[PDB]
Amino acid sequence: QIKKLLVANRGEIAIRIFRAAAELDISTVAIYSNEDKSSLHRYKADESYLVGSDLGPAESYLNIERIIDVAKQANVDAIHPGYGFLSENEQFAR
């Protein structure tokens, strides 16, 4: 029932979630920041979007609004928060 997945995260966990989604024929979406325009998880998804030029380094995986803005612009059904960012965030999930 899930067509597209977005991972609100980076690095090994992102790639990991991507790999499962792919094995489930689910299309993948990745987010990245400025110094992560190199990080490998960006290239392991079907689609990759920058979370706002403006948004800095750590804060850009925290920005609830901008990340959801991305999720809409792609028609994503589901977000996997991974671990250690918005993964425990209440406001983000709501």
Binding site: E23, R42, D46, E47
Partner: protein, 762 residues
């Protein structure tokens, strides 16, 4: 390291593991699909088919599984988008681009691009929404009601067809599409298709013009799209049966064309019926066009091209039921006062709205528009400042301000136009290799009447025949040819006829009398004989019977428009051929594109297969490739982009093949490209293995004077197989044993060094 045939072939052993046969099975195909090996062929797609197979996932299978399941040897070809992109950039980087001055990729002005939110654009209701609302008859009635002067922008088509040999790529157009949509929100239409764009898109720029139409369509959904349609052959290069015109119109309408400016290059109405009908069946706006020549101000110019001729012609186009009347002044001949008198009369004579197109080649362009506006013209063709002037349209930016304090306003957004102008000024920089010769207004236009570009094209052509010092005579002859042929409208391809004839007459010391006297022993240019056969149609005054005779040497001329002679094209047959030649996914747009441009279209495809969608490259990269250390970012789709870094290029090997070291988004990557050195001496030879009896090496630095053997030659020991040059001294290299040559590392004239491998013999 390479693979030897002496051990059983094992590339990689792959193993998957999970809770269920279903999950491990889908773990396997996933890892199989990520697998990529090159330089050799693999059993990869085979296994993929095996895993996917329901009978394998069933578990019930036996040893006879492969022999009984014939689908497993039916594997689909594997293209690679990314590699082909690397291949293109590599080629252009090393061996340059045709007609582009081989220079290091320039560091242009950045000049970032103005954009507008697509949700805002979606809220705009312009002339496109008006066509969908009130039909083509109703758009016309709306136009003639507008007190403001409505503009058509020509930046996407005519503007660069004039100034840049039509080289402006889709990429630069799509980049400002959203800004343009806002800027021209109240515009009548954007001219973005037809003329040379079809031809030039497929051939030179190697991009699909249909893609350009379709993408601009989505991005600019509020303004009318307009194309220029030549009555005889839509956008082709020869003649066509009527069903080719119809098809192309139907499919042009479907992909987003709303306004078709239909013109005949002789103002022959009868050749304009097909395009007209077709456009009407498509429910789109059909613009009926009068081309301007002569000078209605001057009664000595012609007894034919008078005010009464244009009036008569206009009323015939009205009874033909064109929704709009276009005046195509393709040579910028419409003088200010002429404009005011012509339009004024045309307003009174017909009820159609008048749409005026001029070129600024005399420098009086804006004056002409200003006068036309005064006389009540409904629509004019303009371009943004930086893409205007000279052989292009008059500038919209300045027309805007030129009108200040006069009783009629040009309905547009200047602020926007300034911005568009800035964008087009930086972008034009990319096209510097295709800049026109012309840098100045030219009023000799008014005597020889060469349209658009030609007065430079023909000078180039006249220099080729060594008449460079006698161009005035050529220009003089062009004018005489016009009267010799009976005073004709001169637009492609009729103007080509006159230029060809003129070149021909000057080159052959021929005048109006000798062309008839000696004509029995003269091979007149194909374009004139063609013209005198009836193949562009009928010129207003007809053909001079004796001049026709002398040129035709007894060939029949047509007794009707070129169209009625040809069989309808069997399009099913066209589809059959294409689907066989290609994969499978073929469309109607593919079909007429083939019909209209067979050889060109076939070449577009061989390029698509080899290099992919070149139209997605930014223009600098497309023309120059990449320099060392550079990173470029190629937009494939929303969220899908290739980040490529060129790291270094190696010296060429013994085959002139250079190795490019790329990084393609996170991955190391190596590509090979043959370098056309221009001469051969810079090739890096492999060092001979010294303790190898097969490998023959070079004993001294020298040259390859002569090559005597190639791959697969068998002669006895002591055969003189390679002649060298030590230092003004020839030494004849001989074979140590009877055997066969495996590799010859050199060709005649290559520099060699001490210990370089030359020959290998078994």
């Amino acid at each position: 390291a390479e693979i030897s045939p002496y051990y059983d072939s094992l590339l990689v052993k792959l193993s998957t593991h999970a809770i269920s046969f279903k999950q491990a099975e889908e773990k396997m195909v996933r890892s199989l699909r990520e697998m990529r090996i090159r330089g050799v062929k693999t059993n990869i797609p085979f296994l993929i088919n095996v895993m996917k197979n329901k009978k394998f996932t069933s578990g019930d299978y036996t040893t006879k599984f492969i022999e009984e399941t014939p689908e497993l040897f039916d594997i689909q070809p594997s293209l690679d988008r990314g590699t082909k992109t690397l291949e293109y950039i590599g080629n252009v980087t090393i061996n340059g681009f045709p007609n582009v001055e081989k220079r290091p990729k320039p560091d242009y002005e950045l000049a970032s691009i103005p954009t507008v939110s697509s949700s805002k654009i979606a809220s705009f209701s312009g002339t496109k929404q008006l066509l969908d609302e009130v039909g083509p008859k109703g758009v016309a009635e709306w136009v003639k009601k507008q007190d403001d002067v409505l503009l058509t922008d020509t930046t996407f088509r005519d503007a660069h067809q004039s100034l840049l040999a039509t080289r402006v790529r889709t990429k630069d157009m799509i980049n400002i599409a959203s800004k343009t949509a806002d800027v021209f929100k109240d515009g009548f239409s954007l001219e973005m298709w037809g003329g040379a764009t079809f031809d030039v898109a497929y051939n030179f720029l190697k991009e699909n013009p249909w893609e350009r139409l379709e993408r601009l369509r989505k991005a600019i959904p509020n303004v009318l799209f307009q194309m220029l349609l030549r009555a005889s052959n839509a956008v082709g290069y020869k003649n066509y049966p009527d069903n080719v015109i119809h098809k192309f119109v139907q499919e042009s309408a479907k992909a987003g064309i709303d306004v078709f400016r239909i013109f005949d290059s002789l103002n022959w109405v009868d050749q304009m019926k097909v395009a007209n009908e077709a456009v009407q069946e498509a429910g789109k706006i059909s613009e009926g066009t009068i081309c301007y020549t002569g000078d209605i101000l001057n009664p000595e110019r012609s007894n034919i091209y008078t005010l009464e001729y244009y009036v008569k012609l206009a009323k015939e186009l009205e009874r033909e039921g064109f929704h709009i009347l276009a005046i195509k002044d393709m040579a910028g001949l419409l003088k200010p006062k002429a404009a005011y008198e012509l339009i004024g009369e045309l307003k009174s004579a017909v009820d159609l709205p008048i749409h005026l197109h001029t070129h600024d080649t005399s420098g009086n362009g804006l004056l002409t528009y200003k006068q036309a506006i005064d006389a009540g013209v409904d629509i004019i063709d303009t371009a943004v400042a930086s893409m205007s002037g000279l052989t292009s349209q008059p500038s919209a930016n300045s027309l805007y301000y030129a009108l200040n304090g006069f009783p009629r306003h040009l309905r547009t957004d200047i602020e926007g136009m300034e911005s568009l102008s800035h964008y087009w000024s930086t972008v034009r920089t990319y096209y510097s290799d295709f800049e026109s010769d012309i840098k100045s207004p030219n009023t000799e236009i008014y005597q020889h009447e060469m349209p658009g570009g030609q007065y430079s094209n023909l000078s180039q052509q006249a220099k080729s025949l060594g008449l460079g010092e006698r161009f005035d005579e050529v220009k003089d002859m062009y004018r005489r040819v016009n009267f010799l042929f009976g005073d004709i409208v001169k637009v492609a391809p009729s103007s080509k006829v006159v230029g060809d004839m003129a070149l021909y007459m000057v080159q052959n010391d021929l005048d109006e009398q000798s062309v008839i006297t000696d004509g029995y022993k003269l091979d007149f240019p194909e374009s004139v004989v063609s013209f005198f056969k009836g193949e562009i149609g009928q010129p207003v005054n007809g053909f001079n019977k004796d001049l026709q005779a002398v040129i035709l040497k007894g060939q029949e001329a047509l007794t009707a428009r070129p169209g009625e002679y040809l069989e309808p094209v069997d399009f099913e047959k066209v589809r059959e051929l294409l689907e066989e030649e290609q994969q499978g996914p073929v469309t109607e747009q593919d079909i007429i594109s083939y019909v209209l441009y067979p050889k060109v279209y076939e070449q577009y495809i061989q390029t698509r297969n080899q290099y992919g969608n070149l139209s997605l490259l930014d223009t600098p990269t497309f023309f120059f490739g990449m320099r060392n250390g550079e990173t470029v970012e190629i937009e494939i789709d929303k969220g899908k982009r290739l980040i490529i870094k060129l790291e270094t290029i190696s010296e060429p090997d013994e085959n002139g093949n250079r190795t490019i070291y790329y990084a393609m988004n996170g991955q190391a990557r190596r590509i090979y490209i043959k370098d056309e050195n221009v001469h051969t001496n810079a090739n890096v030879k492999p060092k001979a293995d010294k303790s190898n009896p097969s490998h023959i090496g070079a004993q001294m630095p020298g040259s390859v004077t002569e090559v005597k053997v190639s791959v697969g030659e068998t002669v006895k020991a002591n055969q003189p197989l390679l002649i060298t040059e030590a230092m003004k001294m020839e030494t004849t290299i001989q074979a140590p044993f009877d055997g066969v040559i495996k590799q010859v590392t050199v060709n005649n004239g290559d520099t060699i060094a001490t210990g370089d491998l030359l020959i290998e013999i078994e």
